[PDB]
Amino acid sequence: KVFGRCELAAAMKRHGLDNYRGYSLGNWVCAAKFESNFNTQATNRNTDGSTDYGILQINSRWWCNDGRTPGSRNLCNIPCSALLSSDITASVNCAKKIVSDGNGMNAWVAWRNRCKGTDVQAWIRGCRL
Ligand SMILES: [Cl-]
Ligand code: NA
């Protein structure tokens, strides 16, 4: 599913992301934009052989099991395929564990490089939340 901006804001807000560990909804929408372009089916192979999955490009190195990341944990206790669903519960519940791990949203390289310190509220402008 390729989500609309405001649709994904609504979904993330309903799944408790809004101000989750102090991160405003627009931070999350900004991260999803540059990670996946709002596409739940996005996958990207990392040089190390891990893969990033779904709207927030959650990495098989740590967070989900894809059966082909040697030496990897599944800290979210899910198959990585669950992170490509139209329904973002699995992605959102895993992102909560991630952002609580103590680097906050720095865990998302695209959030650190492209969203951090920017007017992120522009990502939720004109959305009925
Ligand atoms: Cl933080
Ligand atoms: Na894994």
Side-chain angles (χ1 to χ4, degrees), residues 59-67 69 72-75 80:
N59 187 316
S60 64
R61 176 59 58 202
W62 298 110
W63 302 111
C64 59
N65 177 61
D66 66 3
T69 317
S72 80
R73 281 253 255 179
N74 178 11
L75 285 172
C80 293

Side-chain angles (χ1 to χ4, degrees), residues 28-111:
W28 293 104
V29 168
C30 185
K33 174 74 179 174
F34 291 120
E35 285 297 353
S36 73
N37 213 338
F38 302 138
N39 178 3
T40 66
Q41 295 196 83
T43 61
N44 292 106
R45 199 91 193 244
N46 305 131
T47 54
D48 67 331
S50 60
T51 303
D52 299 343
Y53 293 89
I55 207 151
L56 292 173
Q57 283 296 278
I58 294 185
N59 187 316
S60 64
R61 176 59 58 202
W62 298 110
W63 302 111
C64 59
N65 177 61
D66 66 3
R68 74 141 198 218
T69 317
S72 80
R73 281 253 255 179
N74 178 11
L75 285 172
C76 287
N77 263 273
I78 48 165
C80 293
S81 68
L83 303 166
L84 308 181
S85 171
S86 50
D87 168 0
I88 68 172
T89 303
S91 278
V92 171
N93 287 2
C94 191
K96 284 183 181 154
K97 286 173 174 71
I98 303 182
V99 76
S100 306
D101 196 3
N103 293 292
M105 285 197 77
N106 291 296
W108 288 278
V109 173
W111 180 80

